[PDB]
């Protein structure tokens, strides 16, 4: 259907290579951040019929992280620095980091959009 899947790879050995580059719990929730970067890259002019297949596996499959009475919805990171967070919180990150990886894979089969 597409006529670029080998720009979608570009993207796609982000995700995979953020894995592999991580292996403590500071590390990888740390590299989750940058795993967030590349889910907006497929946030140009997604359906919400289509969006529904990525939903599927965050919505009610991922978990989210409650910090400074404030979590996120979505499967995803924020960006909190310096915040009254908590240590259980803080590697609930690290689990979604790890599933993120194989979620992002899935969504390389579509289009991206660099922007900063």
């Given amino acids: 259907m597409g006529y670029s899947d080998e720009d979608r790879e570009a993207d796609n050995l982000r995700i995979a290579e953020i894995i592999k580059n991580a292996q403590d719990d500071d590390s990888k929730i740390n590299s989750t951040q940058e795993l967030l ?3 907006r890259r497929l946030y140009p002019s997604l359906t919400p019929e289509e969006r529904e297949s990525i939903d599927k596996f965050v919505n009610e ?6 910090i400074d009475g404030v979590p996120i919805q979505g499967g995803r990171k924020a960006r909190i620095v310096g915040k009254i967070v908590s240590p259980g ?3 609930l990150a690290t689990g979604f980091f ?8 899935q969504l390389f089969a579509g289009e991206n959009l660099y922007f900063q």
């Fill in 37 to 39: 970067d590349i889910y």
């Fill in 61 to 66: 499959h991922t978990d989210a992280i409650i």
């Fill in 89 to 91: 919180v803080k590697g």
């Fill in 98 to 105: 790890e599933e993120l990886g194989s979620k992002l894979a």
